[PDB]
Amino acid sequence: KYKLIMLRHGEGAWNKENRFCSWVDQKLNSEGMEEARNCGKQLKALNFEFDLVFTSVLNRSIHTAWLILEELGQEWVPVESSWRLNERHYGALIGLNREQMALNHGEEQVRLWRRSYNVTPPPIEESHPYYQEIYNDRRYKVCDVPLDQLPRSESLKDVLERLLPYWNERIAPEVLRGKTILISAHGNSSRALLKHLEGISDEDIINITLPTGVPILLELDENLRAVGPHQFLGDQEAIQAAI
Amino acid sequence: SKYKLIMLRHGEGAWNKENRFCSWVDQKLNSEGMEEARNCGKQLKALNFEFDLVFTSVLNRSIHTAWLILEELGQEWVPVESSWRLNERHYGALIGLNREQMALNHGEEQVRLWRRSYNVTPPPIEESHPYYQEIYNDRRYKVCDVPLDQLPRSESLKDVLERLLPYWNERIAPEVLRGKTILISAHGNSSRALLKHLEGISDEDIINITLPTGVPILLELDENLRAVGPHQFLGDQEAIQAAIKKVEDQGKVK
């Protein structure tokens, strides 16, 4: 077998204003940082000793890895970041209040826009309050594919399609070669990698519910295909939230 | 063809306040060292620096200094790479001992030579030392470009140069050649050793370079990667000199 840990960061202001962060580089809050600080205390109690850490290019994912590495005393562990682990691009829904988008278009459409393997939201356009903050940022000018070729909106399926090469090419070699890897990612990019490993269907995946601030162990074979459900490590007094 | 590079020294930790030798002991910043980091970041942002790559040692005080600066800059996504080759000088058996006491029992001349000289090697560390095992049993020093038993047990400034220059030649300098803007988060002696090589400083003159903590060091190089003039400090003139008299006074008596 092989082992692998993924997780997702905690809370920010927009995660409390009930808004769509998505590609907006919004930061963690007191509880967001403390959550990851506790998550590292947990992996410490677990005697966890990583070799490589993989993140998105959004800071809430990076501070999360960093705060974790400090609790472990593992700050020298190599870190790699990639747009291909970014949160899903929610197009024009970025930054708007979701409990009032449900007031315009109705719950059924907003629910579908987030619990759907196949549905692409409206594309963010140059008029959007945050179009510039995303596409002009220097971190997207040095990417592996040109600025114009980055998506302006994504389905959950879109996330996996851009993710999977990064897994095949950057990650999978390393998890092959023994390295205990941590993946500090987001709600959808975590959901998509679990699908491709647990072979989840285009219909069971919209059901999958991953907590935040919680390690997610996952065992593999030499095929690198899953061997069981994803399990959650730590003080299993951790069955909270999930709306 | 006209390159710029930023190099700097981390800030205060507990043993710094205690006036001890840290060397390869993985001491953390205290919260004032953390503010030095943040102040570097602010100054770097006020010059609108955009880094493409950051290099550090594997001592966490140099890594945290770097992470703090990236956050000030909004550049947390900029790749970071770390290497024992940028480590502080290994101070042998003086690791953990107070500096002003060393001057009392050996003279300020002997202490100055121990700290700032080119080819005076410290008394090596022995298995008896309270921090021996925690150093050479640390996982970070395992998967390397050098066997565990071959890691030094003390180091002259010259020994530092001989282990740092290969990492410059093969890892930092090519990225400078590509046009990337580089930040180097290291320590007093590893930065002096690379300044000695880049500036061609004599064996006899490197004794007189003291680097202030928490202060950006701007370096300009030509198309052969040699300095164009002497390294320069960013920040207020008088305050840097006052901070420099500070560092050398650590080895002088009442």
Numbering used by the authors:
A (entry chain B): 3 to 245
B (entry chain A): 2 to 255
Quote the original article:
Bisphosphoglycerate mutase (BPGM) is an erythrocyte-specific multifunctional enzyme that is responsible for the regulation of 2,3-bisphosphoglycerate (2,3-BPG) in red blood cells through its synthase and phosphatase activities; the latter enzymatic function is stimulated by the endogenous activator 2-phosphoglycolate (2-PG). 2,3-BPG is a natural allosteric effector of hemoglobin (Hb) that is responsible for decreasing the affinity of Hb for oxygen to facilitate tissue oxygenation. BPGM is a multifunctional enzyme, functioning as a 2,3-BPG synthase, a 2,3-BPG phosphatase and a phosphoglycerate mutase. The phosphatase activity is responsible for the hydrolysis of 2,3-BPG to 3-phosphoglycerate (3-PGA), an intermediate in the main glycolytic pathway.
To confirm the binding mode of 2-PG to BPGM, the crystal structure of BPGM complexed with 2-PG in the absence of 2,3-BPG was also determined to 2.48 Å resolution. The overall dimeric structure is identical to that of the ternary BPGM·3-PGA·2-PG structure. Similar to the ternary BPGM·3-PGA·2-PG complex, the monomer A active site of the binary BPGM·2-PG complex was ordered, with continuous electron density from Ser2 to Val254. In contrast, monomer B was disordered, with weak or missing electron density at the C-terminus beyond Ile245 and weak or missing side-chain density for Arg100, Arg116 and Arg117. The carboxyl group of 2-PG forms hydrogen-bond interactions with the main-chain N atoms of Cys23 (2.6 Å) and Ser24 (2.5–3.5 Å) and the guanidino group of Arg100 (3.5 Å). Our ternary BPGM·3-PGA·2-PG crystal structure shows a terminal snapshot of the catalytic phosphatase activity, with one subunit undergoing catalysis by tightly binding to the substrate (fully closed conformation), while the other subunit binds 2-PG with a partially closed conformation of the active site in monomer B. The binary BPGM·2-PG crystal structure confirmed the ability of 2-PG to bind to the active site and the presence of an alternative noncatalytic binding site at the dimer interface.
